[PDB]
Structure formats: C-alpha cells, structure tokens
Design an enzyme around this catalytic site. Structure first.
Site, PDB file in Angstrom:
ATOM      1  NE  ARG A  93      30.323  39.297  26.639  1.00 29.26           N
ATOM      2  CZ  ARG A  93      31.130  40.091  27.342  1.00 29.26           C
ATOM      3  NH1 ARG A  93      32.063  40.799  26.733  1.00 29.26           N
ATOM      4  NH2 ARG A  93      31.005  40.166  28.654  1.00 29.26           N
TER       5      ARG A  93
ATOM      6  CG  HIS B  60      38.429  34.176  28.615  1.00 30.06           C
ATOM      7  ND1 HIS B  60      39.431  35.118  28.604  1.00 30.06           N
ATOM      8  CD2 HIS B  60      37.730  34.406  29.738  1.00 30.06           C
ATOM      9  CE1 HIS B  60      39.318  35.896  29.681  1.00 30.06           C
ATOM     10  NE2 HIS B  60      38.292  35.482  30.384  1.00 30.06           N
TER      11      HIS B  60
ATOM     12  CE  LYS C 184      39.101  41.466  30.536  1.00 30.81           C
ATOM     13  NZ  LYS C 184      39.055  39.992  30.341  1.00 30.81           N
ATOM     14  N   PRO C 185      42.820  45.766  29.123  1.00 31.05           N
ATOM     15  CG  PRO C 185      43.759  46.962  30.895  1.00 31.05           C
ATOM     16  CD  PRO C 185      42.491  46.256  30.471  1.00 31.05           C
ATOM     17  CB  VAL C 186      45.856  41.528  30.068  1.00 28.54           C
ATOM     18  CG1 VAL C 186      46.288  40.078  29.912  1.00 28.54           C
ATOM     19  CG2 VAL C 186      47.074  42.431  30.183  1.00 28.54           C
ATOM     20  CG  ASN C 187      40.454  38.566  26.990  1.00 27.91           C
ATOM     21  OD1 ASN C 187      40.002  38.214  28.070  1.00 27.91           O
ATOM     22  ND2 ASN C 187      40.055  38.044  25.846  1.00 27.91           N
ATOM     23  CB  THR C 188      44.044  34.482  27.466  1.00 31.32           C
ATOM     24  OG1 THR C 188      45.189  35.087  28.064  1.00 31.32           O
ATOM     25  CG2 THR C 188      44.443  33.196  26.774  1.00 31.32           C
TER      26      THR C 188
ATOM     27  CE  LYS D 285      47.160  33.867  38.255  1.00 30.30           C
ATOM     28  NZ  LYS D 285      47.967  34.745  37.374  1.00 30.30           N
TER      29      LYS D 285
ATOM     30  NE  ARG E  82      50.379  41.716  29.070  1.00 35.90           N
ATOM     31  CZ  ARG E  82      50.361  41.789  30.392  1.00 35.90           C
ATOM     32  NH1 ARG E  82      50.452  42.959  31.003  1.00 35.90           N
ATOM     33  NH2 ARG E  82      50.218  40.683  31.103  1.00 35.90           N
TER      34      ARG E  82
ATOM     35  CG  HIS F 212      38.290  33.902  36.879  1.00 37.72           C
ATOM     36  ND1 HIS F 212      38.479  35.254  36.677  1.00 37.72           N
ATOM     37  CD2 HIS F 212      39.433  33.455  37.429  1.00 37.72           C
ATOM     38  CE1 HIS F 212      39.704  35.590  37.059  1.00 37.72           C
ATOM     39  NE2 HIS F 212      40.297  34.515  37.522  1.00 37.72           N
ATOM     40  CG  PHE F 213      41.666  32.601  31.223  1.00 38.32           C
ATOM     41  CD1 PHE F 213      42.919  33.136  31.484  1.00 38.32           C
ATOM     42  CD2 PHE F 213      41.576  31.502  30.383  1.00 38.32           C
ATOM     43  CE1 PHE F 213      44.053  32.590  30.903  1.00 38.32           C
ATOM     44  CE2 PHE F 213      42.713  30.974  29.792  1.00 38.32           C
ATOM     45  CZ  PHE F 213      43.948  31.495  30.077  1.00 38.32           C
ATOM     46  CG  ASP F 214      43.083  32.121  38.556  1.00 38.77           C
ATOM     47  OD1 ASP F 214      42.357  33.065  38.948  1.00 38.77           O
ATOM     48  OD2 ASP F 214      44.003  31.640  39.215  1.00 38.77           O
TER      49      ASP F 214
HETATM   50  N1  AMP Z   1      35.350  32.918  39.905  1.00 42.01           N
HETATM   51  C1  AMP Z   1      36.461  33.606  40.136  1.00 42.01           C
HETATM   52  N2  AMP Z   1      37.531  32.946  40.638  1.00 42.01           N
HETATM   53  C2  AMP Z   1      38.652  33.639  40.867  1.00 42.01           C
HETATM   54  N3  AMP Z   1      38.895  34.936  40.679  1.00 42.01           N
HETATM   55  C3  AMP Z   1      37.816  35.569  40.183  1.00 42.01           C
HETATM   56  C4  AMP Z   1      36.594  34.992  39.894  1.00 42.01           C
HETATM   57  N4  AMP Z   1      35.719  35.949  39.392  1.00 42.01           N
HETATM   58  C5  AMP Z   1      36.411  37.061  39.388  1.00 42.01           C
HETATM   59  N5  AMP Z   1      37.691  36.903  39.858  1.00 42.01           N
HETATM   60  C6  AMP Z   1      38.923  37.760  39.488  1.00 42.01           C
HETATM   61  O1  AMP Z   1      38.917  38.580  40.633  1.00 42.01           O
HETATM   62  C7  AMP Z   1      38.504  39.933  40.318  1.00 42.01           C
HETATM   63  C8  AMP Z   1      37.371  40.316  41.238  1.00 42.01           C
HETATM   64  O2  AMP Z   1      37.660  39.841  42.581  1.00 42.01           O
HETATM   65  P1  AMP Z   1      37.167  38.360  43.043  1.00 42.01           P
HETATM   66  O3  AMP Z   1      36.287  37.821  41.931  1.00 42.01           O
HETATM   67  O4  AMP Z   1      36.402  38.562  44.337  1.00 42.01           O
HETATM   68  O5  AMP Z   1      38.430  37.538  43.244  1.00 42.01           O
HETATM   69  C9  AMP Z   1      38.179  39.944  38.818  1.00 42.01           C
HETATM   70  O6  AMP Z   1      38.744  41.096  38.206  1.00 42.01           O
HETATM   71  C10 AMP Z   1      38.852  38.684  38.268  1.00 42.01           C
HETATM   72  O7  AMP Z   1      40.126  38.984  37.742  1.00 42.01           O
END
Ligand code: AMP
Length: 124
Positions: free
Chosen positions: A10, A12, A41-45, A66, A85, A119-121
C-alpha cells in the site's frame, strides 16, 4: 489487521507507471494510499518496478537495518522510485508534497512466509 506485507505494498508499491508522470503524483498517491488520513505522512517513497523484482530484494544483499536488526536487504540494481516529501508549507488536512523521481538502490526489511518486504528502510 492489514499484514505488514500488505501495508508495504500500500505504502511503497506502484507498478502502474515506471516513474512519476506529473508534479502532483505525490499529492494524489499519498492521498489514495491513505497516507494523509489523520495526519500528513511527511516522507514516503514509491517503487516503480514489478512486485516480483521488489520481492526478490529479500534474497539480494543482506545489510543491517537502521533499527539494528539483521533482516534488511539492499537491491543489487537501482530501481525507478519516487520520493514524496511534505513541503515547508503543507498543513493537514491540505497535505502538500514535492515529487522527486529517482533511480536508486532500495533497502527493505523482509519477514514472514513467504519472505517479502515489510519495511522500507532507505534508498541509496
Ligand atoms: N521491520 C522493521 N525493520 C526495521 N525498522 C522498522 C521495522 N518496522 C518498523 N520499523 C521502523 O521503526 C519505527 C518503529 O520502531 P521499530 O519498528 O521498533 O524499529 C517505524 O516508524 C519504522 O520507521
């Protein structure tokens, strides 16, 4: 509850065009993918390759996420993407986005069976 895999598509995935056609792509896409719902939502790809190509990143280059998990993957090839953005001026509920077309490597976190992006990292 929408699965993480479904949420990713949805947020990305846009295989329709192969790049951002108009300057207000982001404005429409961010709306139609329900990313301007209760807030902007401020930023999305958005990614503009086949679902299959994107899914395949889950068996490409393993990298740290990350958040420091070990289930992230970087695309070997660059992909057609669009960075949305929020403008300096935007205000909910009138959300405003600059559209930037780009070709970059994507980094996604993969989970589940089947093993697909959840997740989009980052793009790089
Ligand atoms: N599967 C995932 N892998 C890495 N970071 C994630 C993931 N799901 C969520 N996050 C990112 O991390 C934030 C929530 O913290 P966390 O998921 O515990 O790292 C979200 O706003 C995302 O930007």
């Amino acid at each position: 509850k929408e699965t993480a895999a479904a949420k990713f598509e949805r947020q990305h995935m846009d295989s329709s065009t192969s790049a951002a056609s108009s300057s207000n792509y982001c404005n429409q896409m961010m709306k139609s993918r329900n990313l301007t719902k209760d807030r902007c939502k401020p930023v999305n790809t958005f990614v503009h390759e086949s679902l299959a190509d994107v899914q395949a990143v889950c068996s490409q280059k393993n990298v740290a996420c990350k958040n420091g998990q070990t289930n992230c993957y970087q695309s070997y090839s660059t992909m057609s993407i669009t960075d949305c953005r929020e403008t300096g001026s935007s205000k909910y509920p009138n959300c405003a986005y600059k559209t930037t077309q780009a070709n970059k490597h994507i980094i996604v976190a993969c989970e589940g069976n089947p093993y697909v992006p959840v997740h989009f990292d980052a793009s790089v």
